[PDB]
């Protein structure tokens, strides 16, 4: 239940949420409709939890990579702008919010990571990752360090892992191939091995997080950091004479960051869909709208043609685009959650020494590619064909033919008109279920299976 007659918006704490709230005061002044902008932590996780139920915010802001995942779960309303409004944003930002032909969010801006550096401590930043160790040794002797950045989020280490051949999902023949993950190839190993060595050799600390790295850089304690445009604002405020530049190379190869499009989706269950559409279309994605948010935290390259024209003239925005050109735009597929979770674990376990690189990236391999699920599926496929073999052997135009459905339940050859029941699945997509209860499917009088399967009785097994 969302309160009808208001707008509740969720956006991440590192973005210009105060700028956004002022745009909210513009709307309210004009229409009399209150706009509440909130920044809950774990935003990208807390959403599908609430939105699933029919609750949460009217609008959500996050990079497009997680939006496939919401659309599949059916939590995003289908946005409906016309030709005239789409001609005002760049076509490639529209690609990022298209899942299965449908636009599911408004693109706001393009984010890419850059190398930010202190010009006073380092007038000439390193062009290669490999010279950073020596550079840290010199800086240590002055009671500083070379490089601090967030080691807790795979987003910041990915550029280095991708550099020499690391990838998420293979892109072939139009589609992303969810069964071909490149998190365990020689390139990924080499990039991750390099990061882990910086830590063993005490050029970095495995605990270092977003706030540790930001504060150190803005106090002048470290020469370099890795971050995006939202961070520039805090550096302006600080003493620091900073430059924003292209990322270092690894094995002569450019670092390949994942490029995200900040996006505004609309909660499917909200009764305020049109109000939200009028706020995003007529208030936020205007120059006045975007400027208000940007003058709080920079957005990067915005999705609006009329405002980027100006913004493109900033050399910091040039650098953001240079790095963007060298990376990939993120896939928006639902398997992105699982990939990110997998790589987050690898980097942390590898960094802490809990696991070696080889061990770590293989687990991530198996997790990202859902190989346990793919193995179990092969077993169920085989079992289901056999049960059909057994029956045919023991043996007319009136049966429903055997199927294996998306959950792994084998529906046997059945009589027209039969209500069939089968044990709930023993395992499904990470979760175990009480198999003492059944699912139910009707074989219709016409010899075709009913389209819908009753899975209502299948309950998970959890704590105690």
């Amino acid at each position: 239940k969302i309160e009808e007659g208001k707008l509740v918006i969720w956006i991440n704490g590192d973005k210009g949420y105060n700028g956004l709230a002022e745009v909210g005061k513009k709307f309210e002044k004009d229409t009399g409709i209150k706009v509440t902008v909130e920044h809950p932590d774990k935003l990208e996780e807390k959403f599908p939890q609430v939105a699933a139920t029919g609750d949460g915010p009217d609008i959500i802001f996050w990079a497009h990579d997680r939006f496939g995942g919401y659309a599949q779960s059916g939590l995003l309303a289908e946005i409906t702008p016309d030709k005239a409004f789409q001609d005002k944003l760049y076509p490639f930002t529209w690609d990022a919010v298209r899942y299965n032909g449908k636009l599911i969010a408004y693109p706001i801006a393009v984010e890419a990571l850059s190398l930010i550096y202190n010009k006073d401590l380092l007038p000439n930043p390193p062009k290669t990752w490999e010279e950073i160790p020596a550079l840290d040794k010199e800086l240590k002797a002055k009671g500083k360090s070379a490089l601090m950045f967030n080691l807790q989020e795979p987003y910041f280490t990915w550029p280095l892992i991708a550099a020499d051949g690391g990838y998420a999902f293979k892109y072939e023949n139009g589609k992303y191939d969810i069964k071909d993950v490149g998190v365990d190839n020689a390139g990924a190993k080499a990039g991750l091995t390099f990061l882990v060595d910086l830590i063993k050799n005490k050029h970095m600390n495995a605990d270092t997080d977003y706030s540790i790295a930001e504060a150190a850089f803005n106090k002048g304690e470290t020469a370099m950091t890795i971050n995006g445009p939202w961070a520039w604002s805090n550096i302006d405020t600080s003493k620091v004479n900073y430059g924003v530049t292209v990322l270092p190379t690894f094995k002569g190869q450019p670092s390949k960051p994942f490029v995200g499009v900040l996006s505004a989706g609309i909660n499917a269950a909200s009764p305020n869909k049109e109000l939200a559409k009028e706020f995003l279309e007529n208030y936020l994605l205007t120059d006045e709208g975007l400027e208000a948010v940007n003058k709080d935290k920079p957005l990067g390259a915005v999705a609006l043609k009329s405002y980027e024209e100006e913004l493109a003239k900033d050399p910091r925005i040039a650098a953001t685009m240079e790095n963007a050109q060298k990376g990939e735009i993120m896939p928006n597929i639902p398997q992105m959650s699982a990939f990110w979770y997998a790589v987050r674990t690898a980097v942390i376990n590898a960094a802490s020494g809990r696991q070696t690189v080889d061990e770590a990236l293989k687990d991530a391999q198996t997790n990202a590619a859902a190989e346990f699920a793919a193995l179990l599926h092969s077993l169920l496929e085989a079992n289901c064909s056999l049960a059909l073999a057994e029956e045919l052997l023991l043996d007319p135009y009136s049966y429903c033919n055997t199927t294996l459905d998306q959950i792994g339940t084998c529906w046997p050859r059945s009589a027209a008109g039969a209500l069939v029941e089968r044990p709930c699945p023993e395992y499904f997509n990470g979760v175990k279920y009480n198999t003492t209860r059944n699912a139910y499917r009707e074989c219709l009088e016409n010899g075709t299976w009913a389209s819908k399967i009753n899975y209502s009785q299948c309950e998970p097994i959890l704590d105690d």
Binding site: E45, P48, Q49, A52, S73, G74, D405, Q406, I407, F428, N429, G430, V431, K452, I453, Y455, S456, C458, P460, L462
Partner: peptide, 16 residues
Amino acid sequence: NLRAQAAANAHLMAQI
């Protein structure tokens, strides 16, 4: 964690 996982499946199960 596994509560959000169960919740994701439940919604897929409801649709299917």
